[PDB]
């Protein structure tokens, strides 16, 4: 249980750090970005999942 | 904090200062464009 | 070398050396401890 909880929590932090830098760069980006609302939609939907996952796996570890 | 979240104790002691960095970030961006 | 990079780096360096001093006020000499 803890095996999945901390992984999903550590990945949530790492993903966020990518999103924190990635999202504003992708927006202010002239060319190069049909490329990237996929990855915006990628991380976003994946971010919400991890939040719920860690939120659910919280009651099983504490 | 719960013992399961004792991992991010150094991270927690940093988070409150983050909003202030946004005020400083505005000056970086403005310096980057040369204060138009 | 862009000036805004120089000013930012120097600026961050200023904050660090100052934060060390306020740190020093709570540890070692002048800590009242």
């Amino acid at each position: 249980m803890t095996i999945l909880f901390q992984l999903a929590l550590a990945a949530l932090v790492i993903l966020s750090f990518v999103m924190v830098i990635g999202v504003p760069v992708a927006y202010a980006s002239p060319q190069d970005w049909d490329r990237s609302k996929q990855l915006i939609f990628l991380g976003s939907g994946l971010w919400i999942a991890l939040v719920l996952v860690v939120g659910v796996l919280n009651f099983f570890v504490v | 904090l719960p013992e399961a979240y004792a991992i991010f104790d150094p991270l927690v002691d940093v988070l409150p200062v983050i909003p202030v960095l946004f005020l400083a970030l505005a000056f970086v961006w403005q310096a980057a464009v040369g204060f138009r | 070398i862009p000036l805004w990079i120089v000013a930012t780096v120097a600026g961050m360096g200023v904050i660090v050396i100052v934060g060390l001093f306020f740190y020093g006020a709570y540890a070692g000499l002048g800590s009242s401890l």
Partner: peptide, 29 residues
């Protein structure tokens, strides 16, 4: 103990890095 200092490092540089990336990419700054 200096994990302290590692956090403010990545977090603190996260801001200016975006500006640097948008500069070399010549983005909408």
């Amino acid at each position: 103990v200096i994990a302290q200092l590692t956090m403010i490092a990545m977090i603190g540089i996260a801001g200016p890095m975006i500006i640097f990336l948008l500069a070399v990419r010549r983005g909408n700054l």
